[PDB]
Amino acid sequence: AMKGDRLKANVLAVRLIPNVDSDMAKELGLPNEHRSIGILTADCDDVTYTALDEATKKAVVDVAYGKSFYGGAANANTKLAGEVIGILSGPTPAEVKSGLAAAVDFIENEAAFISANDDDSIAYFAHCISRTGTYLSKTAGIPEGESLAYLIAPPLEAMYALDVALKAADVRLVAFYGPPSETNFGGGLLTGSQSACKAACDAFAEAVKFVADNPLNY
């Protein structure tokens, strides 16, 4: 991948369970009447979280579980692990299947990290969500449907660029991901009007590239 190239995310495995065991439902703390779950793993965590949020907009599902794996996909130690697992729950298998379809389609086509340099060794996520579903709005502590700038980069780049993004528009920090995340990245979620979120995304991206270009000159 060259500088500015999109890095495609991949779904590695998916399973639908029409009627989950009650011990499992208890451990996952599933909502009332949610007897079906859908599980997926993928090789890119933040793309997947955005995808799970998208699924809540497209189907009658809730995000029951979403966690990132230590060291990220480059350090995966089994074939189907990737760097993230997501679980959707819903009242029927048909709705969960629909939620999975939405999530898988999003992961593979709709959001991607971007390479910040020529040897594909620095990458960032700067994704503008026009209207949040139920998952990222809950995460951010904001009303469902608000806009979000989802900004992620490696540790130093993230901290520097997040500050630049906060200065670029009328936005507010609503979730802070101090590095390291499990994948050794950092960043945060910003909210504001859709256009302010987009301005923040653009500024974040430019800032990360600036650091990649000149890491030691301060």
- Give the gyration radius of the chain's Cα atoms: 17
Q: Residue 130 and residue 54: Cα distance in Å, rounded?
A: 11
- Residue 38 to residues 5, 30, 32, 92, Cα–Cα distance (Å): 31, 12, 16, 11
Minimum Å distance from CB 145 to Na ion? 19
Sort residue 205 into left (φ over 0), alpha (ψ -120 to 50) or beta.
alpha
Q: Single out the segment in contact with a copy of itself by CB under 8 A; choices: 129-137, 138-146, 151-159, 198-206.
A: 151-159
Among residues 11, 13, 17, 12, the alpha carbon closest in space to that of 96 is found at: 17
Residues 6 or more apart from 172 whose CB is under 8 A from it? 190, 191, 192
Residue 58 counted as an annotated binding residue: yes
User: Which among Na ion, Ca ion, a copy of itself, none contacts residue 92 (Cβ within 5 to 8 A by kind)?
Assistant: none
Q: Residue 183 and residue 135: Cα distance in Å, rounded?
A: 20
Q: In terms of CB distance, is 60 or 76 closer to a copy of itself?
A: 76
Tokens of 181: 């995340």
Q: Single out the segment in contact with a copy of itself by CB under 8 A; choices: 125-133, 141-149, 158-166, 194-202.
A: 158-166
Query: Applying CB under 8 A, does 67 fall inside the site for a copy of itself?
Result: yes
Please tell me the number of Cα atoms within 13 Å of 54 on its side-chain side.
23
Residues that bind Ca ion (CB under 5 A): 58-59, 75
User: Which among a copy of itself, Ca ion, Na ion, none contacts residue 109 (Cβ within 5 to 8 A by kind)?
Assistant: Na ion
Name which of residues 11 to 40 contact a copy of itself (CB under 8 A): 11-17, 20-21, 23-24, 27-28, 38-40
Residue 75 counted as an annotated binding residue: yes
Q: Report the SS3 class of residue 55.
A: helix
**Which residues does the annotation place in the binding site for Ca(2+)?**
58, 75
Binding positions for a copy of itself, rule: CB under 8 A: 11-17, 20-21, 23-24, 27-28, 38-41, 65, 67-81, 85, 87, 97, 100, 117, 119, 121-123, 154-157, 159-160, 162-163, 166-167, 172-173, 176, 178-180, 182-186, 211-212, 215-216, 218
